[PDB]
Structure formats: structure tokens, C-alpha cells
Design a protein around this ligand. Structure first.
Ligand SMILES: COc1ccc(C)cc1N
Ligand SMILES: COc1ccc(C)cc1N
Ligand SMILES: [Cu+2]
Ligand SMILES: [Cu+2]
Ligand SMILES: [Zn+2]
Ligand SMILES: [Zn+2]
Lengths: 153, 153
């Protein structure tokens, strides 16, 4: 298997460890881990284009979108490659993450290694919201924590 | 023209930003930036195998060494891919880095994107120190600061 890891850090503290595993390069990626320090409810969760955290999470740029599509949920055909939907945290501020995704990859042109994983202030409307912003960012608001996705042993 | 960046941080006061640029696939990579908060003198400077920072810089594992070579200096034929020698800090504790390397790459099987850059406590003896640890780690000692190498705009 190919494996990757991301350490998310932001003010709070928001702290997370997210694991990625892809048994075959034509197969889906299992994404799992825990994020603590966030508000109860949904928080947008995406892979962003650049693995640049020089000025913080803002340096990561837009959602990873190699196919030039509009924003969506992980279930939509019309989505960015980076669109991983929402993580949901409880009252204790903890979001337990267990995702399987068929569109991200840990090799080839959809590869997310060396790009930034970001957890957001607010819910991602999965592009089903009211406005145009829904179709770009899903109205998920500010970036609470991020880290660069690295190759793991 | 491929670009990458790394933000170095540790448990102490050691901070850096290092930029990478490769104009041509299989051309040389220009490595530049600044590191502050280190002692005056030489500090080992290497790409390590994993971009895993779960338990800090220790999680990065050994020097990146896909060709199974012994440790050396960047000017040696016998070197690890990750062997970038030393950065030298002044009395202000600041190390200005300007390197060109043709062994590292930002694409292909020598690719460093998603791996960890590490700045060390002590000098790298470039494998010529004449103990056995010269030929593995170069005796550069603890890891002062590190970060995952990310894709830049
Ligand atoms: C996303 O699913 C998973 C895959 C593998 C492991 C170890 C945990 C989870 N939740
Ligand atoms: C591209 O190379 C460089 C650019 C800017 C500075 C300050 C140093 C180097 N080496
Ligand atoms: Cu995002
Ligand atoms: Cu090292
Ligand atoms: Zn998106
Ligand atoms: Zn080495």
C-alpha cells in the first residue's frame, strides 16, 4: 500500500492527525483520524492546491482542482478533486474522521501528496447552497487548521 | 518550472523557510532561504524519507535513500539522495541558504515533494569523520527543526 499522513495545526489549539491508505493506485483512498478543538457541528474538509504554509493556511490557495470543475460534495460527479465534504465534531470538540474516497489518489495526476489538507470554520454546503460561492468554496468560511500531506511509512 | 517550499519548525526557537525551484525535469534544483535561531557553525541539512511529523521530526525516519547508498556530502558520488550537506550560521544565529543540487528532484523517482527537510544540532561530517555513524547520519545529531516539503505556486 501507499500511505500518507497529515498533522493539522491551528489556533485553539486545533490539532489533528489524518491518515491516508491506498492499496492500489487504481483504488480508493481510506482517510481516517481525529481532529480536536473545533466547535460542535460540521466543518468543511478539503485538499487545497499548494503545500505552502509560509503565511499560514491562506498560502495553500484554492481547493485542489486539476480538472477545472465546480465545487461539490464527495458524492457528486461535479466536484473538485479536493472535495472531501465535512467532518462533524461533537460537544467535546472532537471530529472522528472515517472517509473512503475514489477521486483523490496518492499517485498519478490526482495525487494529493505535498498539498495542504484544511479544516474550515463552517459547514461545506456541498455546492447545494444558495449562491455562487457555494460552487467555489461551499461557504465553509475561514481556515481553522491545516498541514501538508506527507508520504508515510 | 516546478516549485516547492518548506516551513521549518521545532520544539525550540529554530525557524526557517526554504524554497525549491527546478526549471527542467531532470535539471538542477535551486534551494534557497533562511534559518534563524541556531548556534553559530555548521548544521546538517537533509531530506528525510517520510513526510510524517506525527510525533515531531523523529517521525521523518532516516535520510531519503532510494538508491541504497551510504551517507556522504552533496558533492560526492556516494551519497544519499537527501544529502544536502550543511548550512552555516553566523553569530546572529542565522543561516542563509543558497544551494544548487542535481541529485534531488521535484519530479520522478528522486522526488522530494512530501518528504521532510531537517536541520540538525551539529555539523554533518559529509561521511569523512571516520566512525561508522559518519557513513549513515554523518554525526549531525538531534533534529532541531523540520517541515514537510510542499508543492508551491
Ligand atoms: C476510512 O476507514 C478506515 C480505514 C483504516 C483504518 C485503520 C481506520 C479507518 N477508519
Ligand atoms: C533563486 O535564488 C535566490 C533568490 C533570492 C535569494 C534571497 C537567494 C537566492 N539564492
Ligand atoms: Cu478547504
Ligand atoms: Cu537529517
Ligand atoms: Zn471544492
Ligand atoms: Zn545521508
Amino acid at each position: 500500500a501507499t500511505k500518507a499522513v497529515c498533522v493539522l495545526k491551528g489556533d485553539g489549539p486545533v490539532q489533528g492527525i489524518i491518515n491516508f491508505e491506498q492499496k492500489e493506485s487504481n483504488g480508493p483512498v481510506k482517510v481516517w483520524g481525529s481532529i480536536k478543538g473545533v466547535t460542535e457541528g460540521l466543518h468543511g474538509f478539503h485538499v487545497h492546491e499548494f503545500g505552502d504554509n509560509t503565511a499560514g493556511c491562506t498560502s495553500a490557495g484554492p481547493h485542489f482542482n486539476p480538472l477545472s470543475r465546480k465545487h461539490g460534495g464527495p458524492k457528486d460527479e461535479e466536484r473538485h478533486v479536493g472535495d472531501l465534504g465535512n467532518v462533524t465534531a461533537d460537544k467535546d470538540g472532537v471530529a472522528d474522521v472515517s472517509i473512503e474516497d475514489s477521486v483523490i489518489s496518492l499517485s498519478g495526476d490526482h495525487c494529493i501528496i505535498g498539498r495542504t489538507l484544511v479544516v474550515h470554520e463552517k459547514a461545506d454546503d456541498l455546492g447545494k447552497g444558495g449562491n455562487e460561492e457555494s460552487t467555489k468554496t461551499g461557504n465553509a468560511g475561514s481556515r481553522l487548521a491545516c498541514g501538508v500531506i506527507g508520504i508515510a511509512q
